[PDB]
C-alpha cells in the first residue's frame, strides 16, 4: 500500500484538527514524519507559520530565524518566482533552504520548493529540505497533498477570524441597540468609573455620585448582560461583580461621542 497509508495519515490529522483552531506546528510535524524531511511553512512575506526539524543545523543565523519565526525578506520574496513545484535543488540554488556561508558543510543539501495554493491564490510556500536523500515522485505526492492541505488551513484561519469578528460585532450591536438613551448614558459612566475588562461596583453609590437613577444603571447592566456583553454576580451587601465578555464593546462606546 506504501503511499496510500501516508496520504491517509495526512487526511487523519486534518480531520482531527477540524474543530480546534488551526495549528501549523502540528501540521508541519505530521508532514515531517510522513515525508522524512525538514518542513517550513512560509507566508507570503517570510513569517514561518510553523516548521518541524528532522535533522538539526548548527548555524547560529538559522538558529535565530526559527526563534524569531521569520526568514530573510529577500529569500522569501524570490520564492514567488517559483510557479510550480521545483524539486531537488542543490546547495548552489538561490532557493536552497540551507545556509550559504557553508556550501561545503551541506554539499549533499537537497531542497524542494512547493507552492501553496489556496482558493486559486498563492498563499505561501512549503519548503522541504534534507541531507543526501533525493525527493522521489512518491515523496512529491505527499508534499503536494500536504501543501494543498496546509493551504486549506491558512484560509480557514482567516475564515474563522473574520467570522468571529462578525459574531462579536453582532453582539455589540444587539446591546447598543437595546439600550435607551438614558441607559446608554449610564453605561458610558459605569465603564468610565472603571478602567479594565472587569471589576466591582455598587449602583447605589454610582447613582448619587453622578446623579443618575439606581434604576437605570441597574436596567442598563441587565441589558448588557442579556446581550452577552457582560456577566454579573450579585455580590449582596455590596454591589455586583461585572466582567466584560466583549472587548469590542467598550471601543464601540467611545466611537459615538456626544
Ligand atoms: C533559510 C534561508 C536560507 C538559509 C538561504 N539560502 C540563506 O542563506 O539565507
Residue numbers in the entry: 1 to 258
Quote the study's own text:
CodY from B. subtilis and most other low G + C Gram-positive bacteria is a DNA-binding protein that is activated by the branched-chain amino acids (BCAAs),2 leucine, isoleucine and valine, which may be viewed as signals of the metabolic status of the cell, and GTP, which may signal the energetic status of the cell. CodY from B. subtilis consists of 259 amino acid residues. The structures of full-length CodY from B. subtilis determined here reveal the effector binding domain and the DNA binding domain as discrete entities separated by a helical linker.
In addition, we have solved the structure of a leucine 3 to serine mutant, CodY(L3S), in complex with isoleucine at 3.0 Å resolution in a crystal form containing four molecules per asymmetric unit. Isoleucine was bound to the GAF domains of all four subunits in the CodY(L3S) tetramer. The ligand was almost completely enclosed in a pocket formed by the β2-β3 and β3-β4 segments of the polypeptide. This pocket is distal to the site of the leucine 3 to serine substitution that resides in helix α1 at the N terminus. The ligand carboxylate forms an ion pair with the side chain of Arg-61 and a further polar contact with the main chain amide of Val-100, whereas its amino group forms polar contacts to the main chain carbonyl groups of Thr-96 and Phe-98. The isobutyl side chain of the isoleucine ligand projects into the protein parallel to the β-sheet and is surrounded by the side chains of Met-62, Met-65, Phe-71, Pro-72, Tyr-75, and Pro-99. We conclude that ligand binding is essentially unchanged in CodY(L3S) and that the effects of the leucine 3 to serine mutation on the tertiary structure of the GAF domain are barely discernible. Following this superposition, it is apparent that isoleucine binding to CodY(L3S) is associated with displacements in the long α5 helix and a significant separation of the two wHTH domains in the dimer. For the Ile-bound CodY(L3S) structure, where splaying increases the translational and rotational separation of the recognition helices to 34 Å and 45°, a longer DNA recognition sequence of ∼30 bp would be needed.
